[PDB]
Amino acid sequence: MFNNEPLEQIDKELHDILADEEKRQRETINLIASENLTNGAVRECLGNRVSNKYSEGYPKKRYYGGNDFIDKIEELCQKRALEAFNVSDEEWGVNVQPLSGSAANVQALYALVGVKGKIMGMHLCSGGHLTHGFFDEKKKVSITSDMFESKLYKCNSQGYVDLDAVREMALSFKPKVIICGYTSYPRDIDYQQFRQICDEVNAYLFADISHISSFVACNILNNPFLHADVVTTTTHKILRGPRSALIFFNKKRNPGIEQKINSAVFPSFQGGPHNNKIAAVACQLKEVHSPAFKEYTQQVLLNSKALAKALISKQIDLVTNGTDNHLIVVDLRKFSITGSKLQETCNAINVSLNKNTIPSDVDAVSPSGVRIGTPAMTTRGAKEKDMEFIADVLARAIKITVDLQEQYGKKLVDFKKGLPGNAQLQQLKQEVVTWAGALPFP
Amino acid sequence: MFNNEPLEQIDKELHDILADEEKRQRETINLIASENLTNGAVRECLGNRVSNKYSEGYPKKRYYGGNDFIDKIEELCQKRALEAFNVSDEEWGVNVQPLSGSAANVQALYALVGVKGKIMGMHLCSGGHLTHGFFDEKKKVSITSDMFESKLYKCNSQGYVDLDAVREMALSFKPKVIICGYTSYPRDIDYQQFRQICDEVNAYLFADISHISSFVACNILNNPFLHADVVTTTTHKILRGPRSALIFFNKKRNPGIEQKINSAVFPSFQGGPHNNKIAAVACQLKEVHSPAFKEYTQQVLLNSKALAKALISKQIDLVTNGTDNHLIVVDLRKFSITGSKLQETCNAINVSLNKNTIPSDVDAVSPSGVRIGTPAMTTRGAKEKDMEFIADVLARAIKITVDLQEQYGKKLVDFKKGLPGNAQLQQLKQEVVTWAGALPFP
Ligand SMILES: Cc1[nH]nc2c1[C@](c1cc(-c3ccc(S(=O)(=O)Cc4ccccc4)cc3)cc(C(F)(F)F)c1)(C(C)C)C(C#N)=C(N)O2
Ligand SMILES: Cc1[nH]nc2c1[C@](c1cc(-c3ccc(S(=O)(=O)Cc4ccccc4)cc3)cc(C(F)(F)F)c1)(C(C)C)C(C#N)=C(N)O2
Ligand SMILES: Cc1ncc(COP(=O)(O)O)c(CNCC(=O)O)c1O
Ligand SMILES: Cc1ncc(COP(=O)(O)O)c(CNCC(=O)O)c1O
Ligand SMILES: [Cl-]
């Protein structure tokens, strides 16, 4: 007693928008550092009938039966995850049920410390995530600042984690957890030194590697598995999976942690798992471990270096003056424009990027930079050579943005009035569309 | 720089299990009250490239641009929700970002009361959900019992909500929120009398209609929108949508609650929305408002009534002696068999159901009932006349279960040993498989 007419017929309104969305993605130069493009196989899993099944609990300890094939999937996923991140299943466990990065981080945080627990994280403005204890004078913005008691450490004026500052805070504040691994941090982390500080205060070491996950897995960057008690990652960014999260726990360093984490995810926070997610993640973790994906991941770094170097060749300042990974943060202060202004300008030319704070910023209201990343364009087949054009396009966007701020004023209201119809943008959008439109698209 | 081979070729290991899962579902008499079968249109959305997009925030108040098509989808979803539940967008607001029902309930609860806040709900044993403040003396099982201060009311010995007890507890406990709407409650709710109790103590009225949402929308059951400040629902049960949740808030009864709820979902708890979910919910919500879906929903109730009547005709006791909705709880005490045993016996004959507590149950570990629902089999084309056969199959399972407990004993390790090979089960599975396998299957 159901309707099996295809999407186009059943909901023409929705279907059109979706095709328009597809067309925008195909014709956009996507620099969002957190974004990527999923292959068909990952999308076949996400629309699989497996999502019909309620399987609260864990494999072999399910609340309901008929979960034989679901158990096989969730176990095949856990295996592939530990394999991908080069950890022994005797030493490390993994939970594959968290629905997304923010859920996963809160769940893990809860497991280790619980309500009222003391946590430490990098401040949003310096490059941390909201889920790392972010708050404001005015409001506890994240549940992580409110269900826990959080303290926030800043990077120095050059954009770098200052470990001396971390230690000063950890010895006076005395938290049960310190988080490292970040949302807009263009450099590698000294996990060993975090681990050293954690031991000094008897604090847990938590590493959120969502942005750099592929780098850790392919052994291109520092390995926090060597030192961390917990490692979290999303699966949708550089990893190129669906929208989900993984929580890794160090069984060997702390026994009784497996139950704590597993019970945090369920039943403390979530109910039924999303089996289409789990299948989809499994399908990408196969690909993560293949040597072709190591190729891709290397290409992401190659591209990120070339882009920084090309941006520096056009006299554009970068936070930390370069990158060790997939992401760059442009300091726009010398041009007397805001990140918000350039974001607007870049959307008018089909360039997705996001405004980002820099160390000199005192408020998140007017961030002075933008953040770009290479994983999505690397997925679409761009090489080091193709990075000069992108750097060139961003330099032209910066110029046009200065031109429009001169003509229409610095008020954001007024600036946007300038943007529609501008001949330079239309031309620049057209070039962006022509080059972007022809790149391979999964 | 990506692999575009289909799922079968890329990952044959995974694809076989999914085909096996597909086969099991097609060949199962699925009585899980919370399960359903989604159509091809809903699954085409879930596999859509819209999930590629990071769109943190709300429509027109997005952190990043390039969200013009994403904004149209999230707005078309919100609209269709309010239309589907027959509320005016002037009086009611809806949040479409919660990833699942348990996320939605915590998010809404935190909005209304915050950390340390007082809440009331129905006990899990009595038919409530985990997210309604469920705990044990041993442990704060749900975050809703730990991040909030929770008190739990009990249903009476006949399985009904006892409003006198709710009042007695409400005036003494003085909560800020009282929750009704339940996971395994076979009767309609008195929302008016809940409102009156809530008004008496200056508490919010929270209605969780995840199990009954179709009935509320289609006007077959009591409307909680007339009396509730907050209404939560999942989209994947009787609603027949993807795995997601909705939060409805009554703007007129409490202005400035829209911001409380929206801020709760993001950035308090979640990060980026899952736009494939959002698109999938939109697609189902169009179907919800059609009159053909009203026809289906009526049928779920016709079937549920007929099933109860047939079960009573075979001298089987139901909690509350019947049903007003899509679900039944079978009291098995007169047969001296547990729900766990009958779940095991039913998995062996490809009958999906779950064990469930009854009012005489003191502990959750040995529940004395099973819970069944009609939504899924109604989706597969079963009519009133097909319910006698389902009741006949469950009766035979009950007798087989008594026979096996006779031969191998009451201990569960021993009981299951009897299960494989039994002539009657193989016979019963065969008929289950024959009838199940030929029914329509989206
Ligand atoms: C969206 C998101 N998620 N996780 C994140 C972010 C970033 C971010 C986050 C915010 C942000 C700031 C505050 C709040 S708030 O307290 O809820 C309300 C408020 C917003 C604006 C002004 C005044 C009050 C919510 C989000 C602002 C910006 C910025 F670019 F606008 F500055 C960037 C970027 C990756 C986009 C960010 C940075 N940088 C970091 N590190 O992590
Ligand atoms: C799974 C789930 N989710 N939401 C729910 C349930 C039900 C339920 C839930 C439980 C349940 C009980 C305790 C816990 S616990 O304390 O977190 C962990 C624990 C593990 C092993 C041994 C003891 C405790 C978690 C779930 C038990 C049963 C039962 F049938 F076994 F009794 C049923 C059914 C729909 C399945 C339930 C009922 N009835 C209600 N109303 O809602
Ligand atoms: C360190 C970190 N953790 C978690 C998340 C996200 O979790 P959700 O899947 O719940 O969004 C992000 C992405 N932050 C936004 C970005 O980089 O664009 C992140 O950077
Ligand atoms: C009233 C209620 N609320 C919330 C949820 C679940 O949210 P999730 O999507 O996070 O599981 C359920 C499902 N309860 C299990 C069942 O009925 O089978 C429920 O019955
Ligand atoms: Cl999904």
Alpha helix positions (H), B85-190: 101-113, 143-146, 163-173
Strand partners, B231: B207, B248
Mutate to test the interface with A, among B4, B14, B79 (most CBs of A within 10 A): B14
Strands A118-122 and A92-95: unpaired
A36/A171 Cα distance (integer angstroms): 39
Note whether B37 contacts A76, CB cutoff 8 Å.
Answer: no
Mutate to test the interface with A, among B49, B67, B124, B285 (most CBs of A within 10 A): B49
Task: Count Cβ atoms below 10 Å from residue B425 Cβ, excluding itself.
Answer: 22
Locate the domains of chain B by residue range.
Answer: 11-35+299-442, 36-298
First to last CA, chain A: 35
Q: Determine whether domain A11-35+299-442 maps to CATH 1.10.3720.10.
A: no
Strands B351-352 and A61-62: unpaired
Q: Which fold has domain B36-298?
A: Aspartate Aminotransferase; domain 2 (3.40.640)
**Tokens 């943005």 found at:** A401
Q: Are A348 and A425 in contact (CB under 8 A)?
A: yes
* Burial (CB count <10 Å: 0-12, 13-18, 19+), residue B121: buried
A380/A377 Cα distance (integer angstroms): 5
Among A55, A63, A97, which residue has the most ligand 2 atoms within 8 Å of its CB, making it the best to mutate?
A: A63
Instruction: State both tokens at A150.
Output: 């959080």
Q: Which residues of A touch B3 (CB under 8 A)?
A: 39, 41, 287, 292
Strand partners, A354: A371
DSSP assignment letter at A115: T
Compute the half-sphere exposure of residue A287: CA atoms within 13 Å on the CB side of its CA: 30
Identical topology for domains A11-35+299-442 and A36-298: no
Q: Are A332 and A369 in contact (CB under 8 A)?
A: yes
Residue B55 phi/psi, 5-degree rounding, is -135, 60
In total, chain B counts a number of residues equal to 442
- Residue in A41, A47, A114 nearest the CB of B46: A47
Q: How far is CA B33 from the centre of its chain?
A: 7
- B45: closest CA among B231, B287, B233, B267? B287
SS3 B75: helix
B136/B205 Cα distance (integer angstroms): 24
A333/A312 Cα distance (integer angstroms): 15
| 3-class SS string, A132-147 | HCCCCCCCCCCHHHHC
Q: Which residues of A touch B28 (CB under 8 A)?
A: 66
Ligand 1, atom 5, lies closest to the CA of A129
Among B36, B109, B131, B184, which residue has the most ligand 4 atoms within 8 Å of its CB, making it the best to mutate?
A: B131
Q: Are A219 and A289 in contact (CB under 8 A)?
A: no
Q: How far is CA B178 from the centre of its chain?
A: 19
Instruction: State both tokens at B212.
Output: 């009954």
Task: Count Cβ atoms below 10 Å from residue A1 Cβ, excluding itself.
Answer: 16
In total, chain A counts a number of residues equal to 442
Q: Which residues of A touch B279 (CB under 8 A)?
A: 14, 18
Q: Which residues of B331-350 are buried (b: 16+ CB within 10 A; e: fewer)?
A: bbeebebbbbbbbbbbbbbb
Q: What string of DSSP letters covers A16-67? A: HHHHHHHHHHHT-EE--TT-----HHHHHHHTSGGGG----EETTEESSS--
Cα-based distances in Å from A198 to A34, A174, A177, A206, A227? 28, 9, 8, 10, 10
Instruction: Show Cβ contacts of residue B219 under 8 Å, excluding neighbours closer than 6 positions.
Output: B86
Q: Are B127 and B183 in contact (CB under 8 A)?
A: yes
What resolution in Å is listed for this PDB structure?
Answer: 2.5
Q: Are A110 and A71 in contact (CB under 8 A)?
A: no
**Tokens 């279907």 found at:** A15
First to last CA, chain B: 35
A237/A45 Cα distance (integer angstroms): 18
Task: Count Cβ atoms below 10 Å from residue A89 Cβ, excluding itself.
Answer: 13
A407/B328 Cα distance (integer angstroms): 70
Instruction: State both tokens at A285.
Output: 């973790």
The 3-state DSSP composition of chain B as helix, strand, coil percent (nearest 5) reads 50, 15, 40
Note whether A146 contacts B114, CB cutoff 8 Å.
Answer: yes
| 3-class SS string, B203-256 | CEEEEECCCCHHHHHCCCCCCHHHCCCEEEEECCCCCCCCCCEEEEEECCCCCC
Cα-based distances in Å from A293 to A239, A240, A328, B432? 9, 10, 22, 45
A74/B294 Cα distance (integer angstroms): 36
Element housing B330 (H / E): strand B327-331
Ligand 1, atom 9, lies closest to the CA of A124
Ligand 2, atom 10, lies closest to the CA of B364
